[PDB]
Amino acid sequence: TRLKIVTIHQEPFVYVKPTLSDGTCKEEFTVNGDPVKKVICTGPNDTVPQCCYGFCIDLLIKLARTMNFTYEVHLVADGKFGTQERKKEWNGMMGELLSGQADMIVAPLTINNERAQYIEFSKPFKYQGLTILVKKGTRITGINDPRLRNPSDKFIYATVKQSSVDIYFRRQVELSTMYRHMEKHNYESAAEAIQAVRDNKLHAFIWDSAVLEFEASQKCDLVTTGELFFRSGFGIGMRKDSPWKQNVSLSILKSHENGFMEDLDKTWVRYQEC
Amino acid sequence: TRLKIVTIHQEPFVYVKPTLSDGTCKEEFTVNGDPVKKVICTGPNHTVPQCCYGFCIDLLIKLARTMNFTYEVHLVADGKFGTQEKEWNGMMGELLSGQADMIVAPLTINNERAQYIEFSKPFKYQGLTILVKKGTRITGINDPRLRNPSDKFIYATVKQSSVDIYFRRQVELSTMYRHMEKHNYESAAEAIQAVRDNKLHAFIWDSAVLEFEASQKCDLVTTGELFFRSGFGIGMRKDSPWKQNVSLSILKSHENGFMEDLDKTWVR
Numbered sequence: 001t002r003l004k005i006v007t008i009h010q011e012p013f014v015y016v017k018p019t020l021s022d023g024t025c026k027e028e029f030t031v032n033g034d035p036v037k038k039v040i041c042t043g044p045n046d047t048v049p050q051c052c053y054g055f056c057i058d059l060l061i062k063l064a065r066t067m068n069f070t071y072e073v074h075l076v077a078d079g080k081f082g083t084q085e086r087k088k089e090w091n092g093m094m095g096e097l098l099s100g101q102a103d104m105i106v107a108p109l110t111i112n113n114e115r116a117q118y119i120e121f122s123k124p125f126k127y128q129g130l131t132i133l134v135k136k137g138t139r140i141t142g143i144n145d146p147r148l149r150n151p152s153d154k155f156i157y158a159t160v161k162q163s164s165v166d167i168y169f170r171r172q173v174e175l176s177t178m179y180r181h182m183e184k185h186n187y188e189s190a191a192e193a194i195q196a197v198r199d200n201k202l203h204a205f206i207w208d209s210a211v212l213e214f215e216a217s218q219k220c221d222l223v224t225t226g227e228l229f230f231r232s233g234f235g236i237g238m239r240k241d242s243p244w245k246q247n248v249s250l251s252i253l254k255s256h257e258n259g260f261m262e263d264l265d266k267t268w269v270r271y272q273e274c
Numbered sequence: 275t276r277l278k279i280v281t282i283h284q285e286p287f288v289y290v291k292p293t294l295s296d297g298t299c300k301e302e303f304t305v306n307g308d309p310v311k312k313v314i315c316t317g318p319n320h321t322v323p324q325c326c327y328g329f330c331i332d333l334l335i336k337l338a339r340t341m342n343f344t345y346e347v348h349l350v351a352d353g354k355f356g357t358q359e360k361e362w363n364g365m366m367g368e369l370l371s372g373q374a375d376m377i378v379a380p381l382t383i384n385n386e387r388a389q390y391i392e393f394s395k396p397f398k399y400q401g402l403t404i405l406v407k408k409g410t411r412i413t414g415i416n417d418p419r420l421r422n423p424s425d426k427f428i429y430a431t432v433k434q435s436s437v438d439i440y441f442r443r444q445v446e447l448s449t450m451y452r453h454m455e456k457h458n459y460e461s462a463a464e465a466i467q468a469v470r471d472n473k474l475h476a477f478i479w480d481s482a483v484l485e486f487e488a489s490q491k492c493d494l495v496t497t498g499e500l501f502f503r504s505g506f507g508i509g510m511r512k513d514s515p516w517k518q519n520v521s522l523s524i525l526k527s528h529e530n531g532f533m534e535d536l537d538k539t540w541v542r
């Protein structure tokens with residue numbers, strides 16, 4: 001049985017590029033000489049084949065080899081991570097897992113309570129926090145800043161629509177006007193919001209620290225500010241009683257102990273130049 | 275249903291004190307003035323009821339209040355975390371033989387243990403460090419004193435932890451295993467005292483525990499981060515009907531401020 005793997009565009013965990021003329025992927029190599037491994041993902045580009053690669057595709061490839069299965073990677077239809085909205089239905093990668101469109105989510109998918117009620121998560125492959133991406137020289141103290149708590153058109157802030165960050169701000173935050181403001185401004189994808197911070201369309205992007213710290217490392221105009229809230233993991237997503245549960249988690253724990261995960265960090269995440 | 279909980283002495287996760295004359299626990303309060311919740315636990319000191327409290331005990335009480343199991347707690351008989359040497363000893367051993375239904379302790383999540391039992395989602399994520407006397411600095415595992423050992427610098431860990439059998443099995447660490455096989459301790463608290471007495475020069479152990487010890491004691495510091503990070507989790511047998519509700523509760527305790535409050539109370 002071929003596992004339908006679903007994923008999403010999210011650097012540096014998943015890079016998405018167009019194929020060449022002949023339908024292959026461009027032969028790239030890391031600075032240390034090793035081949036960069038890529039797969040033919042299908043999905044929307046504004047269904048046609050594209051080249052997928054990164055932290056999470058290297059991980060997919062590991063698990064494939066260890067558990068001996070075949071995969072067909074596809075990009076989530078709506079371009080979302082997945083929330084549950086009013087009959088309350090799950091969207092994004094979460095919706096696709098449950099409805100059968102996917103067999104496995106391989107992505108920087110945040111492990112939380114809500115989602116774990118409906119799917120199985122592997123043991124975390126990474127552990128990380130929330131932070132705020134801003135222009136260099138924009139001191140944010142924390143969650144309770146004046147410009148946030150008392151919002152305005154002079155200082156716009158946002159997150160990505162239909163992530164666990166979004167529904168938590170809508171449904172759960174102890175603050176009225178913040179979600180009213182944020183609902184006006186939230187972005188469809190993380191790449192768009194990161195670019196908006198650069199082009200001054202957005203003054204603060206609330207998002208995964210693993211993505212934003214990587215982004216700030218490569219962009220000297222951008223800094224992160226805050227360890228907001230608490231830490232949470234990324235894990236593989238599966239249906240609650242699929243027979244892969246045990247071995248996916250065994251593989252990830254083995255990957256942490258034999259240094260394979262540390263290597264994925266060195267290849268894709270750990271970077272500095274500013 | 276009623277669950278048999280097995281736990282282990284490991285400050286600040288589990289403290290163990292004598293009961294009163296009449297076999298009850300005295301009421302105590304924290305630095306804040308909060309009520310120290312305590313549970314009767316049986317075990318060694320000749321098997322007497324004792325009083326058990328701390329991070330892991332507050333976590334057990336929370337799990338019980340969410341899912342409505344009753345419990346009786348006891349301290350592991352042989353005193354150990356558990357290694358496979360194909361039968362397990364320690365808390366692993368008790369859980370597998372049915373002397374416990376659930377392990378509640380700073381129990382390291384690793385591949386080998388996860389082949390035999392279910393772990394919950396982690397309640398804490400941490401790593402290995404070294405407890406030394408202040409003024410000692412260690413770069414990492416490849417410090418001369420570790421790589422090429424002697425009586426001039428004693429170093430050790432606790433017998434029958436994950437650490438122990440990991441050092442004993444690695445071909446790379448052959449030279450270290452033979453020196454540690456002379457000096458490995460029975461309990462963490464014994465090893466920690468040795469660092470103060472200058473009977474042990476370097477104790478290799480969990481950062482959550484050793485960072486707490488250095489906070490209390492100005493003579494001690496932690497130096498380094500060895501290897502990689504790993505979690506603590508609740509242990510259960512593979513076919514426990516509580517494993518889904520345990521993990522859900524742990525995930526929610528990260529998101530509702532509960533774990534953070536345990537940190538303020540017991541750790542910082």
Ligand SMILES: CCc1ccccc1-c1cccc2c1CC(C(=O)NC[C@@H](N)C(=O)O)N2
Nearest residue numbers: 081108109110112129130163164165168232
């Ligand atoms: C908000 C805080 C929060 C509330 C309730 C539960 C979890 C968190 C949490 C804590 C720390 C990082 C992080 C999240 C969500 C989150 C996120 O949504 N990331 C985007 C993406 N990885 C995706 O899966 O939606 N990242």
Ligand SMILES: CCc1ccccc1-c1cccc2c1CC(C(=O)NC[C@@H](N)C(=O)O)N2
Nearest residue numbers: 355381382384401402435436437440501504
């Ligand atoms: C390279 C040691 C190792 C090998 C394989 C898998 C994980 C680790 C690891 C990494 C980070 C902290 C920590 C350990 C073990 C460990 C330990 O054994 N502590 C004692 C106690 N918590 C108990 O559960 O036995 N503490």
